[PDB]
Design a protein around this ligand. Structure first.
Ligand SMILES: [Zn+2]
Length: 257
């Protein structure tokens, strides 16, 4: 179907998903010169204390770490959000080289990777229903830069070989996503979309200003996974990012002066 490999990549998606040329597509470039501080924007509330990780799996586009979202165990509230949003999964987008990989950019600058923690609005009952609504999803985006190793990321790295190809899954319990957050929760926010098909415009983006640091060794593990399934012609999972889309009539708001 769709992918990131030139013949089925983002430039082709619109043929199957016309919303690709929509009015609030993601990702976008964050221009700090035009991203205005909004005093009304309140502090984020991330309550990940009792997050319950279930498993990790390679879906052919990235690897997702899935959480138990039956109760309000790992939720995002506050900021620009109206209700309570439950964490369902996180995944990354990364490049073939260190100088590329993030979806969002800051003053056109790219990071080595981008982490997306995906949450859904509890009033819709489940993720399936929420993904269809304009205020259905909230995604926390966190940039990764290469430097010192991130201790909280190592548990994830130490399991990637076991889900190398598409469709592979593995139990992955007792993972604490708090170990992936930066010190500061200062953020920019704007209304956008899923950056992969079906590209629905149901996402409130919250992109953190402060990057986290990961080692060259940890990001190398990412690049060893495969897009392809077991046996098929090997395609290394790299450059699974969508290029920046037009901002059009949206404004990006900043939570900080
Ligand atoms: Zn993503």
């Amino acid at each position: 179907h769709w992918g990131y490999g030139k013949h089925n990549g983002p430039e082709h998606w619109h043929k199957d998903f016309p919303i690709a040329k929509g009015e609030r597509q993601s990702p976008v470039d964050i221009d700090t010169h035009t991203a205005k501080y909004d005093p009304s924007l309140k502090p984020l509330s991330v309550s990940y204390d009792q997050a319950t990780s279930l498993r990790i799996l390679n879906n052919g586009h990235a690897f997702n770490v899935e959480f138990d979202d039956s109760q309000d165990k790992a939720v995002l509230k506050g900021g620009p959000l109206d209700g309570t949003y439950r964490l369902i999964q996180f995944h990354f987008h990364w490049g073939s080289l260190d100088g590329q990989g993030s979806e969002h950019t800051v003053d056109k600058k790219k990071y080595a990777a981008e982490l997306h923690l995906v949450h859904w609005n509890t009033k819709y009952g489940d993720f399936g229903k929420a993904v269809q609504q304009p205020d259905g999803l909230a995604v926390l985006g966190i940039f990764l830069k290469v430097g010192s190793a991130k201790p909280g990321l190592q548990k994830v790295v130490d399991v990637l070989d076991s889900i190398k190809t598409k469709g592979k899954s593995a139990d992955f319990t007792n993972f604490d996503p708090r170990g992936l957050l930066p010190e500061s929760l200062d953020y920019w926010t704007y209304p956008g979309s899923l950056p992969t098909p079906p590209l629905l415009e149901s996402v409130t983006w919250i992109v953190l200003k402060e990057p986290i640091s990961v080692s060259s060794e940890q990001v190398l593990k990412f690049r060893k996974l495969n897009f392809n399934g077991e046996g098929e012609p090997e395609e290394l999972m790299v450059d699974n990012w969508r290029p920046a889309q037009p901002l059009k009539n949206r404004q990006i708001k900043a939570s900080f002066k």
